[PDB]
Structures are given as structure tokens and as C-alpha cells.
Amino acid sequence: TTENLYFQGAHMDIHRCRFVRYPASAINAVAFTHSALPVVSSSKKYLQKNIQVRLAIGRANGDIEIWNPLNGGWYQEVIIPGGKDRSVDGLVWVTDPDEEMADGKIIHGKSRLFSIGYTTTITEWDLEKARAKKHASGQHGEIWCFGVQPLPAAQNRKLVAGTVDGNLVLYSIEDGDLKFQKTLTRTPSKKTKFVSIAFQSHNIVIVGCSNSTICAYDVRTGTMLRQMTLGSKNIIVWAVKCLPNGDIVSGDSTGQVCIWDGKTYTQAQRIQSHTQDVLCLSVSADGSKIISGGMDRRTAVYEPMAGQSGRWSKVFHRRYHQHDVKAMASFEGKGMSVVVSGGSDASPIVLPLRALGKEFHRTLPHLPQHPTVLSAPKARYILSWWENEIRIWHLLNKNRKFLAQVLIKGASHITSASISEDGTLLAASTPTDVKVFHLDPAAAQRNGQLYIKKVNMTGTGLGATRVQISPDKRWICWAEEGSKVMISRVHATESADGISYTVSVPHKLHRLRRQIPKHILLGGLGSYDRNVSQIAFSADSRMLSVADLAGYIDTWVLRGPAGERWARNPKAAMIPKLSAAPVVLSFSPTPRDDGDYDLLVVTTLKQLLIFNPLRGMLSEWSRRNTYPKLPEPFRDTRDQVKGIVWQGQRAWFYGVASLFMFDLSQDFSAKWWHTYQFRPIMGIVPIEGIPPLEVALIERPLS
Numbered sequence: 073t074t075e076n077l078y079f080q081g082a083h084m085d086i087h088r089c090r091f092v093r094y095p096a097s098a099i100n101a102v103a104f105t106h107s108a109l110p111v112v113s114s115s116k117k118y119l120q121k122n123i124q125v126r127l128a129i130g131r132a133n134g135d136i137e138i139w140n141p142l143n144g145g146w147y148q149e150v151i152i153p154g155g156k157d158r159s160v161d162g163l164v165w166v167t168d169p170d171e172e173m174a175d176g177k178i179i180h181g182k183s184r185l186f187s188i189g190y191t192t193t194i195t196e197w198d199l200e201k202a203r204a205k206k207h208a209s210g211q212h213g214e215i216w217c218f219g220v221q222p223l224p225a226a227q228n229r230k231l232v233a234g235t236v237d238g239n240l241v242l243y244s245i246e247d248g249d250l251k252f253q254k255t256l257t258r259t260p261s262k263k264t265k266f267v268s269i270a271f272q273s274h275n276i277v278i279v280g281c282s283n284s285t286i287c288a289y290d291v292r293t294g295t296m297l298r299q300m301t302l303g304s305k306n307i308i309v310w311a312v313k314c315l316p317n318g319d320i321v322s323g324d325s326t327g328q329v330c331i332w333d334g335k336t337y338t339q340a341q342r343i344q345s346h347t348q349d350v351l352c353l354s355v356s357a358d359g360s361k362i363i364s365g366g367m368d369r370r371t372a373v374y375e376p377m378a379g380q381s382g383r384w385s386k387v388f389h390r391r392y393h394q395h396d397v398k399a400m401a402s403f404e405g406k407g408m409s410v411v412v413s414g415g416s417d418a419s420p421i422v423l424p425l426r427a428l429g430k431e432f433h434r435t436l437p438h439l440p441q442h443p444t445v446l447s448a449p450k451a452r453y454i455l456s457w458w459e460n461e462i463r464i465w466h467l468l469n470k471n472r473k474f475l476a477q478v479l480i481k482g483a484s485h486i487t488s489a490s491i492s493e494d495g496t497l498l499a500a501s502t503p504t505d506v507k508v509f510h511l512d513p514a515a516a517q518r519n520g521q522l523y524i525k526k527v528n529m530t531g532t533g534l535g536a537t538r539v540q541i542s543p544d545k546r547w548i549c550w551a552e553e554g555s556k557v558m559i560s561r562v563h564a565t566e567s568a569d570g571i572s573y574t575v576s577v578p579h580k581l582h583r584l585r586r587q588i589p590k591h592i593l594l595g596g597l598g599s600y601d602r603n604v605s606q607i608a609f610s611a612d613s614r615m616l617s618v619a620d621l622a623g624y625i626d627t628w629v630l631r632g633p634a635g636e637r638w639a640r641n642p643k644a645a646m647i648p649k650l651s652a653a654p655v656v657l658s659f660s661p662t663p664r665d666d667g668d669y670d671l672l673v674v675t676t677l678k679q680l681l682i683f684n685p686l687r688g689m690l691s692e693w694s695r696r697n698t699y700p701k702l703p704e705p706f707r708d709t710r711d712q713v714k715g716i717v718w719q720g721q722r723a724w725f726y727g728v729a730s731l732f733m734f735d736l737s738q739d740f741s742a743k744w745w746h747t748y749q750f751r752p753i754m755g756i757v758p759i760e761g762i763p764p765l766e767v768a769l770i771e772r773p774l775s
Contacts, residue, residue, distance in 0.1 A: 073088055073089075073471075074086060074087060074088060075088055075769070077747070079745040080735075080743065080745075081762045082719055082722055082733065082735075082762055082765070083764040083765065084719070084724070084764075084766075084767060085764065085765065085766040086767055086768075086769045087766075087767070088750075088769055088771065089454070089768050089769065089770045089771070090770075090771055090772070090773070091465070092445065092454075092456045092463070092465075092754065092772060093772075094439065094456060094458055094754060094772045095133075095458055095459075096417070096438055097131040097132045097133040097135060097154075097418060098131065098132040098395075098414075098415060098416040098417075098418060099129055099131060099399060099414025099416075099418060100130050100131065100132050100161050100398055100414075101128075101129070101130035101161060101162050101398075101399050101414075102127070102128070102129055102130075102400055102412050102413070102414050102420070103128045103130075103165050103185075103401050104126070104127055104128075105124070105125050105126045105127075105167055105183040105596075105597075106123070106125055106165075106183075106403065106405060107357065107401075107402065107403065107404070108403070109123065109404070109405030119178070120405075122178075122180055122592055122595070122596070123596065124180075124183075124596040124600075124601075125140075125141060125403065125405065125406070126138050126139065126140060126141075126149075126183070126597065127140075127401075127403070127412060128163050128165065129414060129420060130160030130161070130162070130163045130399075131159075131160060131418075132159050132160070133154045133158070133459065133485070134153070134154020134158035134189065134485075135151055135152065135153060135154045135160070135485070136151070136154075136160060136163070136187065136197060137150070137151050138151075138199070138600075139420075140653070140676075141403065141408060141410070142652075142676055142709070143406065143407065143408060144408070144709065144710070145676055145677070145709030145710065145712065146422065146434075146436055146712075147653060147655075147676045147712060148437075148440065149441075149605075150199075150202055150537075150554075150600075150603055150621075151440060151442075152202050152203065153484040153485035153486070153487055153502070155460075155482070155483045155484040155485055156459075156460065159189045160187050160188075160189050161187075161188050161189050161216075162187060162188040163185065163186070163187050164185070164187075164218060164219060164220055164231070165183055165184070165185055165186075166183070166184045166220045166229055166231075166245060167181050167183040167184075168181030168182050168226070169181050169223065169226060170595075173591060177591040178591065178595075179591045179594050179595040180595035180596045181595065181596070182595060182596060182597075182598065183596060184196060185197045185199065186218075186231065186245075188217075188218055188233070190214055191214055191215070192209040192213070192214055192215060192235075193209040193215075194207070194208050194209070194215065194218065194233065194243055194250065195207050195208075196250045199597055199600040200553075200554070200598055200599050200600055200602075201553040202487075202503070202537050202553060202554045202603065205250075206249070206250045208243060208250045208251050208252055209252065210241060210243075210255075211255075212235045212239045212241045212252075212255060213235035213236040213237035213238075213239060213262075214236045215233045215234070215236075215241075216235060216266060216267050217233065217234045217266060217267055217279075218231055218232060218234070218243075218269060219231070219232060219270065219271060219277075220232075220245075221277075221291060222271050222274055223274065224274040227247075228244070228246045229244075229245050229246065230243065230245070230253070230291070231243040231244075232256070232271075232277055232291060233269075234265075234266025234267070234269050234279055235266060236266075237259075237264075237265070238261065238262065238264040238265060238266055239255055239256075239258050239259070239266070240255075240257040240277065240279070240289055240294060241254070241255050241256065242254045255294075256289070256291070256294035257294040257296070261283070263283075264281055264282060264283045265282040265283075266280075266281060267280055267281065267282055267308060267309065267310060268280035268311050268312045269312070270312045270313050270314050270320075271314065272288065272318055272320070273318070274291075275290055275291045275292055276288055276289070276290060276291070277290075277291055278312050278320055279312070280310065280311065280312045280322060281308075281309055282306065282308045282309075283305060283306065283307075284301060284302045284304060284307035285299055285301055285302065286299075286302070286309055286312060286320065286332070288337060298337040300332060300337055300338075300339065302322075302324060302328075302330070302339075303326075304326075306325075307324050307325055307326055308324060308325040308349070309322050309323070309324045310323055310324065310325065310350060310351050311323035311350060311351065311352050311353040311364075312353070313353045313354070313362075315334070315355060316357075316358070316359040317334060317359065317382075318335065319331060319332060319333060319334040319382065320332035320334060320337075321353055321355065321362055322353075323346075323350025323351070323353050323364050324349070324350055325349045325350075326349075327345065327347050327349065328342055328343060328344055328345065328346075329342075329343045329345045329346075329350060329353075329362070329364050329372070329384075330342050330343070331382070331383065331384055333382070340383065341383050341384060343374070343384065343386055345366075345372045345374075345389065346364065346366035346367075346368050346370060346372065347366075347368045347370075348366050348367035349366055349367040350364055350365070350366045351365055351366055351367060351396065351397060351399075352364070352365045352398060352399050352400045352413075353365075354400045354401060354402045354411045356402060356404065356409075356425055357402070357404045360375065360376060361373065361374070361375060361425060361428075362374040363400060363402075363411050363413075363423070365393075365396075365398070365399075365400055365413055365415070366396070366397055367396045368396075369391050369393055369394070369395060369396055369415075370389045370390065370397070371389060371391070371392050371393075371397055371413060371423070372386055373386070373387045373388055373389070373428050373429065375387050387429070388428075388429045390429060392413065392421045392423075392433060392435075393413065393415045393416075393421060394416075394417035394419075394774070394775050395415050395416035395417045396415045396416050397413055397414075398415040399413070399414050399415070400412060400414070402425065404425070409424065409425040410422050410423060410424055410425060411425060417438070417774065417775070419435050419436055419437070419438045419774075420435075420436040421436065422434045422436065437728045437752060438752070439753075439754055439772055441655070442714075443754055443755030444457065444458070444754060445754045445755035445757055445770050446489065446490070446491050446757060447757030447758060447759055447768060448491045448492060448493055448494060449493050449757075449758050449760045450495070450760050451493075451494055451496075452466060452468070452759045452761070453465065453466055453491065453495045454467060454757060454768045455491055457486050457489050457500070458485070460479060460486060460502075461477055461479055461480070461486075462477070462480065462486070462489055462498070462500060463476070463478075464476040464477075464478070464522070469761055474520075474521070475521065476511070476521045476522040476524060477521065478498070478509065480500050480502060480505075480507055482502040482503075482504055482505060483502075483504070484502050485502070486500050486501065486502060487501050487502060487503065487535070487536065487537050487538070488500065488501045488536060488537060488550070489501070490539045490540050490541040490548075492541050492545045493543060493545075494545075495511055495513070496511050496512070496545075496571070497509070497510065497511070497527075497541055497545050497562065497573065498511055499539045499548055500539065501535050501536035501537070501538075501539045502535045503534070503535040503553075504533055504534070504535045505531070505533070505535050506531055506535060506539060506548075506550055507526075507529070508527040508529045508548065508562075508573070508575055509524050509525065509527060510524070510572075510573050511524060512525070512570075527573050527574070528574065529560070529575045534552050534553055535553075536550035536552055537550075537551050537552075537553065537554045537603065537604070538550060538604060538606075539551075539607075540608070540609065542609045542616075543609055543611060543612075543613050544613040545562055545564070546561065546564075547559055547560065547561060547562060547609070548560050548562060548575065549581075549607050549609075550607070551603075551604035551607065551618070554602070554604060555599065555602045555603060555604065555620075556580070557581040557582075557583060557618055557626070558579065559578070559579050559581050559638060560575050560578050560579065561575070561576040562574075562575055563575070563576065581638060582640075583618070583624070584624070584626055584644060584645055586624055586649075600621070601621040601622035602622060602624070603620055603621050604618045604619070604620050605619060605620060605621055605653065605654060605657075606618060606619050606654055606656070606657035607657075608657045608659055608671075609659065610659040610669055611660075611661040613630070614629065614630045615629055615630070615641070615659065615669055616629075616638065617659070617685065618657075619654040619657045619673070621653045622649070623649045623650030623651060623652065623653060623675075625647045625649075625650070625654075625657075625671075625673070625683070626644060627640075627641035627647065627671075627685045628640060628641055628644075629641050629642075629686075641685055641686070641688075642688075643685070643686060643687060643688025644685070645688075646688030646689060647685060647689075648690070650673065650675055650679075651675070651677065651679070652675035652676045652679065653675060654674065654675055655674050655675065655676060655712060655713050655714065656672065656673060656713055656715065656725070657673055658718070660672060660682075660723075660736070661718055662720065662721055664684075666687075668684040668685070668686045668687055669684065669685055669686065670684070670691060671684070672716070674713045674716075674725060676712065678699075678702065678706055678711075679699055680694075680697075680699075680702060680706075680734075681694050682694045693736065693739075696739050697739055697740050701740040701741070702740065703740070703742075703746070705732075705746055706725075706732055706744075706746070711727050711730045712727050712728070713726070713727050713730075714726060714727050714753070715755050715756060717756050717765065717767060719733075719762070719763065719765045720762060720763055721736050721737040722734065722735050722762075723736055724756070724765075726750075726753050727753065728753050729748060729750070729751040729752060729753065730746065730747075730748055731747050731748075731750055731753075731756075732744065732745070732746040733745045733746070750769060750771065751773075752771060753769065753770070753771055754770040754771065755770055756768070756769045756770070757770075
């Protein structure tokens, strides 16, 4: 339960905590913005720099996570919240062709994301607002599968969905909308389910069924062109894919992977590859590799049989996951060649397509990139949240006490929370609300927990994606729908009762306009990367900074004489743009002699930078201690930093499986230290009782 680190005078006293039962949600769906990018040479590499490849991961709890593959440094960027009685069962990206403007500038095709969730509704997601963009339903059964019709027209794209009562339905996503368009087919039997879908060409849809059949349908007419029969009369074809040559690969409930000739629609081959249901398939872009995953937890790899034309041989199988393999998808481009699989064990697993089965796979964290753990250091509270409940514990100065379970009502999960250092002011957000609470350690209920008082806060009803209370408890800053920065004054009133809190109406804080060419803004993910990932106050609560995924840092200063106002930091525009997304944004608590601040940043590329924001520039320390001088273990981009803990002028940085300590009063060339003994880390948070440091280190192992 306890550990103690000592590095050349610095003591860290650790409470090793495993009692925060952060739940794992199964991965049900995996999908890339692009399956494949065109091959280009080093001379033409710069023609793909502005293409934005993202991975979407859909969870059983309805969460949708946007990941950036970052040439192997996988980084979880944004989590769009699910909600009570919501689940994601399928994901589809629709990415337009690139388009050349009259002046020869390339607009990279825009990417739109849709999902289905065991209902009659298809949902399109607003990546720019991290919330639902539109819902569309029709009179048909629950949708069990869907896909986008491939291009042969390009300005009038179509989705085809199969339902549980055996209907193909067509949805139009024309001119940026989403609506039910037409029912194509009604199977004779309402017990026949359409469970998997793939396109063989623009007009021919392949559908796996629950009645031991695979059917080919013409998209224009709805006519059944070909029926393929398997085997029982209840063989479920959970997965169908088409090879580049038009051949069909199927995976079914009996554990078989079958190959069907694309022209005759006859069974060319049967491979008894799994011992339980085959749930998912993946095919490489060149059609030379097939991947399958099953309820038997195994992943299998197939390659073309030497000599024999159009037939396949199983190369190997291996258990990568701890539970079933529910979904997988491949990406090939910019030197990357991977398949990503997922299942009930909640970890995404990345296999390198060019070196399968050689122990080069990677298991990505099952814990969110955001720590999702907080402390109130002066109160010795530790806090976490998931779904729609906040849990609060007290580490006694029977060293544990469960203080409160705060319920946040809403159709969606909590997106963010913040607590004051003394544990009396608590804030939490959803996409529809920003909620504020007043905590009194003397206010108890019969169930033993704290009595939590609501603090009135009026708002736009657009909620927030991140929320942050200032250290002096006078301000609450949040990011509304990712891109808009808001701030409210927290008014404390004293009386015989003690303190009572009220909150002002939100005030808008304006970020700098950035110079981004119109061909970049109009393509790919639009303004998705302006999503604010960090909000940071300085220790004196007189400066405020935010940074977004694109790497822009905005700064405000508090002007004294409610005679106070937040104003634009005069030298804000001089702060450079980061070349990679910030994972940490933190004001050093140590005052500077020149009255400026040390604003520290860590990026996904493991850059470590300190800016002096009032002067508007990189600090002298950063000018000496550049990237090549950082310790080689720290520069490993497979080790993503999640958080920071200050110890005076020493800074501690942790990832999911790593802990570093740098003495920032010193220059690099040893005076830096690290350890890998802690894993898997949710977060490390200080508590109060060379200054020694006392922290709660929260680990959340699954297996």
C-alpha cells in the first residue's frame, strides 16, 4: 500500500491505491478515416503531410474515442461520451476524394463519422463539437450492420443498412445531411437478420445473414442477384469482406472462414480456423493478407497458398486479447502498415502487417489518456469519475474513507471534473450542463456520505468538454464544445453560516485567430484539432492558458482594479505553435525573479518546453536544454506522458507505465531519474500533510 522513492534528496511518499474501480468497456467497433493512402516517394512525401488519419474506437458504453496513430506513437485525443442505455455497435467513416481547386491547391477529402447502436437510428458525429451532429431513423427494424457505397455520384453519397427483420435500407448523406431515403428489400421472413455487410462494387452489396446464407443485392433495385448457402439452418455470418479481385471472405458462427469466388459466387474454400464464432475480419490493401478474430479470443492470419490460385492457407493463430476479438480494421499509409483489434478486454491491440507474429505487436492502454483522477491536496481528497458518477475518497492524515458519490444527471457521461484545493468547490460537465457543488466536511447524511449542495449556474446548455477551477477558487474556466473558452467568477459570501458560493453568468474568452489556409480548413477533419485539451491557471491565479490538439497556446492575464477582468496576454501571439499535441500544460509554482512565469509543455513527441508567456518567448532554460539533450528513455514516443506533479523546481512526469523526475533548476548533459515499476497508472496526485512530496498513485490493472 505504501512506497517511498528517494533521488538525491527528493522524497516521494506514495499511497499505492487500487480501490478506484474504473470500469472497462468492451471495444465493439474499430474504424479508420482512410483504409489506405496512395503510395508516394520521399520526393512527394510533402503531398500527404496535411492528410489527417484518425482511428475511431466505439465502446459498449457508447463512448467514441478518436486516436491519432502518429506513426507509431498512438495518442488518444478526444472521447465523445456515451450515455445511459446507449451503446456503439458499428462505425463507418466516409472520406471524400481529394479535390483540386482552380488554383491547383489540394483540399484533402473531408471525413465524416457515423455509428449504429442496436436501435433503428443512425447517428452522425460532430467531431468539431465532440457531440452528436444528427440522428436519423426510419420504419424498419433495428439496424445490425451498415456501410457506405463506394464511389464508381461523389456529391450524393449513400449508406446502406441491414436490419434485424431482414431489410436493406438506404440513407442519404447528401449535402452534409443524414436522412432515411428508401427501403430496398424486405426478406420474406422477419426472423432473417442482416448482420454483416460489405460492398463488392458500387452497385453490388454483400450481406451476411443469420439463416446460413450470404446474399448479393443490387443497390439500385434491391433485387437479390445471388444467394450463397452454408453448411445447420442457423449459421450466422458475422463478418464479410471483399478482396481487391472481388472474392468474398466470410466468417461465421461455426468458426469457419470461407472464400467465395467473386464471379460465380460459389464456395471455393472452407477453413476451420476458430473453435467458436468468427466475429470480425480484416484484409490488407494489396489483398495478400487476411486477419480474423473470434469469440475463442484468437487472432488468425492467412496468406495466399503457394502455387494454388485464389486459395488461402492459415499461417498462424495467437491469443493476443484476454477475451473475445470483436472488431478489427487496417490502415496502410505514410510508412505504417497495421491492423488494430479490440474486444471485451478493452485494450486496443496493434499488429504490424509486415511482421505478424514476431512479438512486435503493441497493447495500447485500457485507461484514458486523461488521468481521470484528481486530488484536493489541502483536504487530502482523491477523486475519480466515470459514466455519470463522481466518487470521492479521503486519505486520513482505516486510512481510507469513502466520502461521496455525486450523481450528474444527463443523457451523456461526465466529460470533465475539477475540485478546489481545499475540497469545498466541485465542478463537473456533460455536453448539456456545467454543474457546480459546495462541499462541507461537516455536512453528513444518514448513509455516512457528505451532503452535497448544488450551486446555481446558468448557461447556454451546450455544456463543456473540459472544466478547471482556479487555485484561489475565484474562477471556473471551461471549454464549451471543445473550441470555445468560457469563464465565470465565483463569488464567496461570508455570514454566520460560513461561506456561500454564487457563480456569475459565463463570459466568453476569445482566442487568437490563426493563419490557416482555406484549403486546409475546408478538408479532412475541419476544425476538429482546435479542440482545447488543457486549461491551466498559474499558482497565483493571475494567468490563464489553454492549448489545443493542433498545438496553439492561448494566454490571458488578470487585470486588477468586481473591478477585475481577464485580458489578452499582450505577447500571446509570439508564443510559437507546437509541432505536436500537448499532453501537459502546467505553470511552475516557483516565482521568477523577473516577475514572469514558467509555462511548461510536454508533447506527444516527448518535447519538453518552458515558455515565459509575459515576455512571449521560449525560456533561457529551454534554450539550453533542447530536445536532443533529453534522456533517451524519455524521448520514446511509445511512452506517452499523462500528467505532472511538482516538487518545488523538480518536476515528475508519469505515463501509464512510467515515472520520470527532472530537476528543472539544472541543465542536462546524472541528475534525472526514472522507474517503470508502476503500472498501469491512472494518475498521480499530490496530498498535503527540498520539500518532501506525498502523493496518491492510482493503478487500475485489469489482468
